[PDB]
Ligand binder design. Structure first.
Ligand code: NA
Ligand code: NA
Ligand code: NA
Ligand code: NA
Ligand code: NA
Length: 444
């Protein structure tokens, strides 16, 4: 009688540097993104997260707003530079914010899902080598252990990392994200140290044996289509799929990097970081996998260079990111996980959403009908996955509110709530009203 059971979690998601602001308050020191956004040319119009949505000060209003929407779960991230603003220097004032935030969530019947690392690495850590320095595994472990011990009574659902593909390849090879290096070998080593750090947190988590508490990781996944049935395009799609998806799915769930990608990358950079002991730590059993899904890719062979697939435009509708709106890949990826990687393990959609050109009209409303339709199409695919036997436990819309979209600054609006940054006023978009009805009726 319900398309989504009473226990299914309808959620929304944010991340610390994208919404919190208060960047220099209560002991917080700079992250790599505070630094990167101040480097000329790195972030749209030199936007930064000094203030963002001011969620640090407005969190009670923002929790009340989710309660009034009927939100059942809230995914947020915890800012490492608030908790350890200097190496080995714990900041209780930082922890106090996350205690009052999660206290407010629980008292309004919202289940907290905490991302431990969502890209705001402390600058002190980068200055010591950052994710390129294997000692980060211990720094990250000490940070995660402090969170588990201080917040375990508050938070029962933990996500070690958000989108390690971004923190590695987008940050160290492509150079769009902080710290902005452009070196394939560095990105590969960073991917390994990220996964090893995830593994250390899981090891610590299991040793604590926290009552009724679950840990997982969040991966951004796509689906790659070859532009034609040619051998050239099949190899192009295999490489693109290995670069985005299997490079992380295989070590996590198979205990082995994908050998075709090890050999492919090996022609261009060192891959000598691979070893049995590390892969055993990386592949420890998880309680759930979080899936971040936005779009697909249609790719054509390029010019035999490194990762040079041509991006094909199939001529369909797109968001303001240029991302094709292709809801069927949400179902296809969840099914692929069920059949190839996670089997009967619980899955959560930890991000899905879209950026459109949102305007407050003269009636004071944001009539974001393209986002209403986007979310409607994707929740219909979640429902189809459920009805086909998939183990989907919840769905977090990216984002609760418009926020700092990394290298795009505030120019891309993903919220179901509009934020007028001059006043920090929140305006419910029509997509939020649609979502409120979905949660209430559990019907689509
Ligand atoms: Na911020
Ligand atoms: Na700036
Ligand atoms: Na697992
Ligand atoms: Na679970
Ligand atoms: Na589709």
């Amino acid at each position: 009688m319900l398309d989504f059971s009473k226990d299914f979690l309808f959620g929304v998601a944010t991340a610390s540097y994208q919404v919190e602001g208060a960047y220099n308050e209560d002991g917080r020191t700079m992250s790599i993104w505070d630094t990167f956004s101040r480097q000329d040319g790195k972030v749209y119009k030199s936007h930064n997260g000094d203030v963002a949505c001011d969620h640090y000060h407005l969190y009670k209003d923002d929790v009340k707003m989710m309660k009034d929407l009927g939100i059942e779960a809230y995914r947020f991230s915890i800012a490492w530079p608030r908790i350890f603003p200097a190496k080995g220097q714990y900041n209780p004032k930082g922890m106090d914010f996350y205690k009052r935030l999660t206290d407010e969530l629980l008292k309004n019947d919202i289940k907290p899902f905490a991302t431990i690392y969502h890209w705001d690495l402390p600058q002190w850590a980068d200055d010591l080598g950052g994710w390129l320095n294997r000692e980060i595994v211990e720094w990250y472990g000490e940070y995660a252990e402090k969170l588990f011990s201080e917040l375990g009574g508050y938070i029962k659902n933990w996500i070690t990392l958000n989108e390690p593909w971004c923190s590695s390849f987008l940050s160290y090879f492509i150079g769009e994200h902080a710290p902005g290096h452009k070196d394939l070998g560095e990105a590969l080593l960073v991917s390994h140290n990220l996964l090893l750090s995830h593994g250390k947190a899981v090891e610590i988590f299991r040793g604590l044996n926290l009552d009724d508490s679950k840990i997982g990781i969040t991966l951004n996944l796509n689906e790659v289509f070859p532009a034609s049935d040619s051998d050239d395009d099949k190899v192009a799609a295999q490489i693109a799929d290995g670069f985005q998806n299997r490079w992380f799915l295989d070590p996590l769930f198979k205990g082995k990097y994908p050998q075709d990608m090890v050999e492919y990358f090996g022609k261009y950079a060192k891959v000598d970081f691979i070893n049995d002991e590390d892969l055993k730590l990386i592949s420890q059993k998880l309680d759930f996998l979080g899936v971040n899904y936005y779009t697909r890719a249609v790719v054509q062979k390029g010019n035999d260079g490194l990762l040079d697939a041509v991006q094909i435009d199939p001529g369909n509708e797109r968001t303001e990111m240029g991302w094709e709106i292709y809801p069927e890949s949400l179902y296809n990826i969840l099914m692929r996980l069920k059949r190839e990687y996670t089997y009967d393990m619980p899955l959560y959609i930890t991000e899905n959403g879209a950026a459109f050109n949102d305007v407050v009209e003269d009636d004071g409303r944001v009539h974001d009908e393209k986002r209403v339709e986007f979310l409607k199409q994707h929740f219909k695919e979640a429902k189809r996955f459920l009805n086909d036997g998939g183990n989907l436990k919840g769905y977090f819309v990216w984002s609760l509110m418009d926020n700092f979209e990394w290298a795009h600054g505030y120019s891309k609006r993903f919220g179901i709530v509009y934020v007028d940054y001059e006043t920090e006023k929140r305006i419910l978009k029509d997509s939020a009203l649609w979502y409120k009805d979905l949660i209430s009726t559990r019907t689509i």
